[PDB]
Write an enzyme that holds these catalytic residues in place. Structure first.
Site, PDB file in Angstrom:
ATOM      1  N   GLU B  60      11.966   0.134   4.144  1.00 53.79           N
ATOM      2  CA  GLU B  60      11.431   1.537   3.585  1.00 53.79           C
ATOM      3  C   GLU B  60      11.196   2.808   3.151  1.00 53.79           C
ATOM      4  OE1 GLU B  60      13.018   1.638  -0.768  1.00 53.79           O
ATOM      5  OE2 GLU B  60      13.106   3.695  -0.915  1.00 53.79           O
ATOM      6  N   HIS B  61       9.442   1.605   2.649  1.00 54.17           N
ATOM      7  CA  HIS B  61       8.825   2.427   3.697  1.00 54.17           C
ATOM      8  C   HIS B  61       7.995   3.273   5.623  1.00 54.17           C
ATOM      9  CE1 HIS B  61       6.152   3.272  -0.052  1.00 54.17           C
ATOM     10  NE2 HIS B  61       6.589   2.160  -0.659  1.00 54.17           N
ATOM     11  N   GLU B 137       1.684   1.796  -5.502  1.00 54.05           N
ATOM     12  CA  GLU B 137       2.883   2.332  -6.038  1.00 54.05           C
ATOM     13  C   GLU B 137       3.001   0.686  -7.051  1.00 54.05           C
ATOM     14  OE1 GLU B 137       5.578   4.050  -4.125  1.00 54.05           O
ATOM     15  OE2 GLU B 137       6.670   1.967  -2.961  1.00 54.05           O
TER      16      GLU B 137
END
Lengths: 49, 446, 57, 78, 52, 420
Positions: B60-61, B137
């Protein structure tokens, strides 16, 4: 991180009906609490007698 | 004039079509000038084998950092050429890449999505940069205690199963993360029959079907090993995790029981149960006149900062319970009151509370489905979970079948005399022992 | 900016531009991931062989 | 494009404050909680100056000088 | 002054609580019969007809 | 296809608008020109407590009746507030709209405003201000409005700490009887016919008739404010005065902010097309974000830049952003970027009117400001009728005007306004 926080194995403490991580619970759960409350019930019968 | 059932009947039907690859192409049409087009993939963190735990999150990154056809930020420039919004998420069971755009640019956005489906270039410098970003994150998400409690509850409720592991995975997996395992994950978890292309808003189903036949043709169609990956059931474990750290000002405690799943219909009834208890936080303006007894007691005795009730469902499993943040000096009392409400729904559920919960559930179900984006999310998750888009008229028919007798029967089935999973974080010394909580999960007066 | 998949409901909710589209912090580097220390790690093993039927030969 | 809060894109909920008196069916994002913070100390009330003669001398004319004694009360001069 | 307790919600609450109260009355009756050895009841139970 | 939006100008000044969506749930809101623009220095924080008094006792409906009646039908009552107008919106099932409109209009026309109820509510407004100031953008925009305007817009959204425990019921009644007058009310409804709204408006809202107390006329003062609070990040907002709402220069400033960077488009995006992000990224190597701020009210606007950067590198980020805007003002812009900014602005407005609540907010705002509704196609045509010379002129107006700078963080390396 908090995602490193992992529960270790309890397989040297668990009951035989919940040793498998693949099969679901809630099928043998009523049997387990039936056994435990049966122990509690016969103790309470004895002390009431 | 029109009634509520007639108005729900007038809602347009979701058109569903199939491809030769196995792609599910679904669309809902409204009279809006914008649209939301997304791809939903049945590949979350449940499909990993503890050595590739952060793989889907790391995909997803890297999904928005260039492709083979559009190398690098020029891809991003394309999304900013038309004023489109590019969003994504990854769950424990689903992955979604969605774009909000206008309707006139409806061809090219589909092609852009097709690029992110099947041509995601994985440069090694991008791997190192996104590894740093993922570590940044995760250490940012450690500050939010609600997500930490959510991950703790999933870790202690499904121990030893692939549902205990987090979406982002452990830190060491992020450090030693190669490219070959990402290529293997992309090969074996991004196949055509596990994908739904969903569109909501100003779309045409025939044009979208033609675009999916043009761009999304021949995604994988091949398992590459003749080995279909499946999902074994996950064993629920009544257990308890307590993270004690007294320097935090507030404590977060979540208590859950095992949920039924997705296809089991009493979910709907359980939603009504949550609608009886509801949610509360300190920014509300009801005072002591709130309809929920837990919320009124928490306002009157100044017990909790906030509470919420959740019914989280996965494939034949789930969690069902409450999560509250409060100061230390009230924690035990809050638990007591919460348990009392659950046993009230197991013993003395009245008809007025059932009617109020049904009205709240109708309001929540319709008020969620406003705008193109939650409708597209509903379409994608409905074709991935139930295999079909359940119409709102069927939701209204399912809500109308609920009276107080079956509500207290279902609450006695799932809540009464069951072992909960407890996750605590903060000054949780006054959080009661598991024997006390398990004792509070039943009544001696029944 | 518009929707974030959250709020314990398995659904998209309304979120800010700095929370839905920039979920990472503006800190320069990640600080540290500290390890967990324990008394003694337990043993993990599975058992699914079971057995078979009995009869002649 | 009217509706100033919606005209400003990212600064939509910063320029406008939204509250509720009756809670909705949909649960809000970022429920939020006030942490238990500190309290200011309680000090005795001071003399008001509601006549022109009491205000005589109350206006500052010098650099501000603080003084902390050990068994002397802490004082300040204007 | 119990006119507050007249309504459909209290009637439904009482109707829900009839069988639990009846079962508790059955428990209390059996407990009072057993602990006192009442001859009006144990002479009707087939097994306990040995002490009388 | 649903029916068209239809308007009615009542003789007492009330503007009612209704669109029959045939929606399963109807949303009905009253928009009142009674923001914090209309508070002088002796009644600060009255609008905040009036916003939080939407469930107090009214005539015909108590607090218990209002809360237990809206909460039983599943619908909701909410109130939003800019610095210029408030909006009381209820929403719920269409079989409940009669009691929902009864509750809304009883709340918004005749509150009793009892003393013990506002005495209970003042602690709630303190908690509300604490939760709202938990983040960092709200405080710096509040200080930016404090320093940017000398009157009538420096009044904050939230009640000041000295006023807590000092708002009485009398000034709440005074504020309601001055600014909740029928000439500045827009009653808008999605999912309800015009007959029901018209009959309720004519039967119930003939209590006030006047224009009300107005005449704020905010003025610009400029300057700077510094908040040393020791955060590792530094927030900064540097704005200047700009044109009001309802003008071509407002569209020019919106095209200018979407050219300079008006929020992200990609989750964890690199902000490739934002000019300020391009300049800082070619200048720096640290995490940051730079966006363009534009708040255009009915008489004045604020346009500027908003940076969040490091404490040690705030000066280079702010200088790079200001030099990028200076480069735009000199004429260094291409027509393709202006076309991309126009497309971004059109898509942003169309996504803003996507959901029903944002659409109803747009209906109420345009009904208050103009008395009618422009279709979105006319708004897109007004966007498309802007030249790049207007964008250059807007940037030149921002650069060559006096400034308002609000800064927060470790401001040792943060430059002052004289150094920009």
């Amino acid at each position: 991180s908090h995602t490193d926080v992992k529960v270790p194995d309890f397989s040297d403490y668990r009951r035989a009906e919940v040793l498998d991580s693949t099969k679901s619970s809630k099928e043998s759960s009523e049997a387990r609490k039936g056994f435990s409350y049966l122990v509690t019930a016969t103790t309470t019968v004895g002390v009431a007698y | 004039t029109a009634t509520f059932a007639q108005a729900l009947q007038s809602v347009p039907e979701t058109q569903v079509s199939i491809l030769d690859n196995g792609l599910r192409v679904a669309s809902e049409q409204s009279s809006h000038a914008t649209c939301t087009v997304g791809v939903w993939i049945d590949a979350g963190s449940r499909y990993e084998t503890e050595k590739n735990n952060g793989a889907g999150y790391f995909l997803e990154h890297l999904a928005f950092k260039g492709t083979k056809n559009r190398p690098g930020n020029a891809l991003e420039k394309e999304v900013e050429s038309i004023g489109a919004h590019l969003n994504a998420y990854s769950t424990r069971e689903h992955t979604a890449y969605l774009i909000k755009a206008l309707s006139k640019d409806l061809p090219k956005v589909v092609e852009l999505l097709a690029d992110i489906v099947q041509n995601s270039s994985l440069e090694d410098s991008q791997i190192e940069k996104e590894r740093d970003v993922i570590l940044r994150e995760m250490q940012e998400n450690d500050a939010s205690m609600q997500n930490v409690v959510f991950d703790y509850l999933h870790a202690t409720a499904f121990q030893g199963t692939p549902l205990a592991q987090a979406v982002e995975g452990p830190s060491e997996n992020v450090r030693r993360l190669s490219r070959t395992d990402l290529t293997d994950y992309l090969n074996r978890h991004y196949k055509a029959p596990r994908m739904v292309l969903a569109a909501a808003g100003g779309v045409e189903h025939q044009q979208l079907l033609d675009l999916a036949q043009k761009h999304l043709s021949s995604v994988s169609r091949v398992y590459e090993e003749d080995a279909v990956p499946g999902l074994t059931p996950c064993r629920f474990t009544g257990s308890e995790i307590r993270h004690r750290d007294d320097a935090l000002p507030l404590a977060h405690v979540a208590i859950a029981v095992e949920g039924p799943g997705w296809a089991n219909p009493d979910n709907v009834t359980l939603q009504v149960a949550n609608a009886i208890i509801g949610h509360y936080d300190c920014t509300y303006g009801g005072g002591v006149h709130l309809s929920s007894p837990l919320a009124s007691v928490a306002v009157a005795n100044k017990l909790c900062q906030s509470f919420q009730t959740f019914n989280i469902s996965y494939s034949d499993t789930g969690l069902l319970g409450a999560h509250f943040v409060c100061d230390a000096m009230s924690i035990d009392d809050m638990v007591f009151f919460l348990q009392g409400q659950w046993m009230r729904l197991c013993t003395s559920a009245t008809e007025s509370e059932v009617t109020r919960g049904k009205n709240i559930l109708r309001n929540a179900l319709v008020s969620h489905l406003d705008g193109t984006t939650p409708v597209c999310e509903d379409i994608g998750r409905s074709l991935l979970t139930y295999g079909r888009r359940i119409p709102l008229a069927e939701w209204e028919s399912r809500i109308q079948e609920v009276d107080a007798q079956m509500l207290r029967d279902i609450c006695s089935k799932y809540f009464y005399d069951q072992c909960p999973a407890v996750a605590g974080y903060g000054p949780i010394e006054q959080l009661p022992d598991y024997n006390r909580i398990r004792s509070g999960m039943f009544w001696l007066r029944f | 900016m518009y929707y974030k998949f959250s709020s314990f409901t398995q659904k998209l909710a309304g979120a800010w531009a700095s929370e839905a589209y920039t979920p990472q912090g503006l800190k320069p580097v990640s600080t540290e991931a500290p390890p967990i220390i324990f008394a003694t790690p337990t043993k993990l093993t599975s058992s699914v062989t079971a057995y078979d039927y009995s009869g002649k030969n | 494009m009217l509706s100033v809060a919606a005209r400003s894109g990212p600064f939509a909920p910063v320029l406008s404050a939204t509250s509720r008196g009756v809670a909705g069916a949909l649960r809000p994002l970022l429920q939020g909680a006030v942490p238990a913070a500190s309290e200011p100390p309680v000090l005795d009330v001071k003399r008001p100056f509601l006549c022109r003669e009491s205000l005589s001398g109350q206006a500052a004319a010098r650099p501000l000088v603080a003084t902390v004694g050990l068994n002397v009360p802490a004082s300040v001069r204007f | 002054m119990l006119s507050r307790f007249l309504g459909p919600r209290y009637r439904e609450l009482a109707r829900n609580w009839i069988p639990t109260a009846g079962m508790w009355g059955t428990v209390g009756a059996v407990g009072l019969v057993w602990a006192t050895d009442w001859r009006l009841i144990l002479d009707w139970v087939p097994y306990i007809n040995g002490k009388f | 296809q649903p029916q068209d939006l239809e308007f009615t100008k009542l003789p007492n000044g009330l503007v009612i608008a209704s669109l029959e969506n045939y929606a399963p749930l109807s949303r009905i809101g009253l928009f009142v020109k009674a923001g914090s623009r209309y508070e002088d220095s002796n009644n600060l924080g009255t609008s905040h407590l009036l916003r939080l008094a939407s469930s107090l006792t009214t005539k015909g409906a108590s607090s218990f009746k209002i809360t237990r009646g809206i909460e039983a039908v599943g619908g909701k009552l909410s109130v939003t507030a800019t610095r210029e107008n408030m909006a009381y919106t209820v929403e719920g099932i269409r079989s409940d709209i009669e009691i929902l409109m009864e509750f809304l209009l009883n709340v918004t026309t005749a509150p009793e405003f009892r003393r013990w109820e506002v005495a209970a509510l003042r602690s709630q407004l303190k908690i509300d201000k604490a939760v709202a100031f938990q983040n960092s953008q709200t405080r710096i925009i509040e200080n930016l409005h404090d320093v940017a305007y000398k009157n009538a817009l420096a009044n904050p959204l939230y009640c000041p700490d000295y006023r807590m425990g000092k708002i009485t019921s009398e000034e709440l009644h005074y504020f309601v009887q001055n600014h909740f007058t029928s000439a500045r009310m827009a009653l808008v409804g999605l999912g309800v016919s015009h007959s029901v709204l018209k009959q309720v408006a004519e039967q119930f809202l003939n209590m006030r008739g006047g224009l009300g107390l107005a005449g704020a006329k905010a003025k610009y003062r400029g300057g700077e404010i510094r908040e040393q609070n020791g955060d590792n990040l530094v927030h900064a907002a540097i704005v200047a005065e700009s044109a009001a709402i309802g003008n071509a220069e407002a569209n020019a400033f919106s095209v200018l902010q979407h050219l300079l960077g008006a929020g992200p488009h990609i989750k964890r995006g690199n902000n490739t097309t934002s000019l300020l992000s391009q300049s800082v990224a070619k200048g720096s190597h640290q995490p940051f974000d730079v966006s363009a701020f534009n708040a255009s009210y009915s008489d004045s606007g604020l346009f500027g830049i908003y940076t969040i950067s490091q404490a040690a590198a705030a000066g280079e980020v702010i200088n790079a952003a200001y030099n990028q805007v200076k480069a735009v003002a000199q004429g260094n812009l291409s027509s393709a970027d202006v076309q991309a900014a126009k497309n971004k602005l059109k898509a942003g407005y169309l996504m803003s009117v996507e959901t029903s609540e944002g659409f109803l907010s747009e209906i109420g705002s345009q009904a208050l400001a103009a008395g009618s509704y422009m279709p979105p196609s006319t708004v897109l045509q007004q966007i498309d009728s802007v030249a790049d010379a207007d964008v250059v002129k807007a940037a030149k107006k921002f650069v060559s005007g006096k400034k308002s700078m609000a800064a927060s963080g470790n401001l040792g390396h943060t430059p002052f306004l004289d150094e920009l």
